[PDB]
Amino acid sequence: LTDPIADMLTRIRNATRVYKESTDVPASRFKEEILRILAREGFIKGYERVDVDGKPYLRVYLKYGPRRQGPDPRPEQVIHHIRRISKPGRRVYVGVKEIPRVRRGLGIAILSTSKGVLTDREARKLGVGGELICEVW
């Protein structure tokens, strides 16, 4: 496994697309800090540290919209979109002045900075930059 982070985000996207209530990803005090952004910003209900076969995991509680009318009754997603930016193949770093506005504000860019994991909004607030972990909307 070469990208624990992408692996997580993908475990989610994959789950969210068949409408699972939850899905578990292998635990990391960094992966957590990202989920701590994902829930706070209201993309997930939240997470809890559980265990599977003795091994530390993060069970992640997924969130969607109403049932819908039409021949396809499947609800809208709350996480419509989530994708790595920086990767191990190509680390992506931004100064504060060049942090992107995801989707006109309606989405976020989580970022690892030396003031911890922030959103665009949060980063610009404390006025620091860093590795741009990913984007969600």
Partner: protein, 99 residues
Amino acid sequence: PKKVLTGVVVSDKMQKTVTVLVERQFPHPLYGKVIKRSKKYLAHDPEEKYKLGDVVEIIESRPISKRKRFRVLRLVESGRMDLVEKYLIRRQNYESLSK
């Protein structure tokens, strides 16, 4: 200031001179990724005290010879032959890239 660089000694087969290999990273100007590039400096060692495997710092200095414009500033670590291997194995591999 006088530019200072840190690197491994890869040759001591000269008298009063060592070859110090300095490495650096930098984002690719277009493709973003952090990439390494390295370069050998001939460093003045009047004392023949620096040896193969030494990780050292060298300081840009007034020219000593053609090609020698750095003196060894000071030792940093001893015995990194594992680096010297990296370099040497690459040179040795060159015998296979010919015709």
